[PDB]
Amino acid sequence: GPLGSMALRACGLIIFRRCLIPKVDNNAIEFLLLQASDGIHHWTPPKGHVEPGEDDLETALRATQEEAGIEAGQLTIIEGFKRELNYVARNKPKTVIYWLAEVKDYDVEIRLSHEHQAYRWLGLEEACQLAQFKEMKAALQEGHQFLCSIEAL
Numbered sequence: 098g099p100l101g102s103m104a105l106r107a108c109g110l111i112i113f114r115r116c117l118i119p120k121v122d123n124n125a126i127e128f129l130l131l132q133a134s135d136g137i138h139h140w141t142p143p144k145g146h147v148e149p150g151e152d153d154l155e156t157a158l159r160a161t162q163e164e165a166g167i168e169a170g171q172l173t174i175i176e177g178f179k180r181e182l183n184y185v186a187r188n189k190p191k192t193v194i195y196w197l198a199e200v201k202d203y204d205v206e207i208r209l210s211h212e213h214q215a216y217r218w219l220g221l222e223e224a225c226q227l228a229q230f231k232e233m234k235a236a237l238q239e240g241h242q243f244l245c246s247i248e249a250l
């Protein structure tokens with residue numbers, strides 16, 4: 098079979114819980130993270146495998162509720178921000194698109210999948226500390242960077 102599709106299409110959701118008012122005027126926003134069920138036990142947001150016929154954000158949305166139980170209706174996908182991570186995992190480059198999302202519930206339900214055994218809620222520093230992977234450290238980095246350029250929507 099003469100393959101023609103280069104790399105694998107993926108889509109994740111960079112979730113962030115926005116608190117009411119600021120505390121120490123430093124932090125305020127958090128990020129949802131899902132620890133891998135094996136390997137290096139790295140922490141990454143709900144990423145899915147978007148199909149050519151499937152939508153980009155949807156794959157990231159479904160993956161959210163699939164690997165976190167939270168759907169677009171339970172969060173808030175911020176528009177204007179879009180970045181994808183390209184890298185060959187086992188032996189195939191996966192393109193992971195990331196969208197900023199804010200869960201309406203602070204204690205929102207967290208329904209993970211087989212691909213995730215645990216999750217966490219941390220800011221940029223921590224989300225970056227766990228997501229040792231530079232690519233992710235950036236996704237979460239730009240997230241807070243962009244959101245800080247908006248207002249609330």
Ligand SMILES: Nc1ncnc2c1ncn2[C@@H]1O[C@H](COP(=O)(O)OP(=O)(O)OP(=O)(O)O)[C@@H](O)[C@H]1O
Pocket residue numbers: 133134135136137139141182184185186187211212230231232233
């Ligand atoms: N940002 C990244 N850049 C490059 N490689 C990464 C990045 N994040 C994770 N990886 C690695 O890429 C691989 C992705 O795992 P795999 O392709 O097996 O996905 P998966 O099937 O979604 O995961 P799982 O086995 O846990 O179900 C792992 O070895 C992981 O450590």
